[PDB]
Amino acid sequence: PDSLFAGLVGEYYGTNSQLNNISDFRALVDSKEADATFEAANISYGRGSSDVAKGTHLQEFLGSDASTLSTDPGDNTDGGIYLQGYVYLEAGTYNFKVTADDGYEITINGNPVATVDNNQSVYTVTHASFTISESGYQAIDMIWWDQGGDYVFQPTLSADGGSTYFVLDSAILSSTGETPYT
């Protein structure tokens, strides 16, 4: 049985190898069990300095979500997160606008909808629009990593053509696709 909560299933992975791109982080996820798990209920993390994978920087980064950490990871030089679950969206057009250091990839219903395939100091990209064909819980996943140094990750989503944006949080997230009453 998987727990039902108003959030995405979060996994954190650390490494002492360099993360240069999405492929490197995905390979890290493939390589071992998560160094920690958590509930991603308010997906607006950071900013901080001095490596997300060192000390208590991950806790600080995750903020409001860190109280659900399964463990306190040890130090690593590089690290990142893999989030998966569901997001309630009505049928229509949407686009992400994401602030991040380093890179990331967000997919909805298996298709990438926001990609930065490289390291970067903090930068905000307004991504291309995508459509949702049927109202309901949509499958969503995210990866994000830090190669070192500073770190931040705030995807925001617009339903109104880029006029307003919102953070993905417990209002609309579901870990399993069932309706959370938590």
Ligand SMILES: O[C@@H]1[C@H](O)[C@H](O)CO[C@H]1O
């Ligand atoms: O956080 C930043 C970014 O990772 C950049 O790519 C290299 O410098 C680090 O300090």
Ligand SMILES: [Ca+2]
């Ligand atoms: Ca794994």
Ligand SMILES: [Ca+2]
């Ligand atoms: Ca730690």
Ligand SMILES: [Ca+2]
């Ligand atoms: Ca590094």
Ligand SMILES: [Ca+2]
């Ligand atoms: Ca960084």
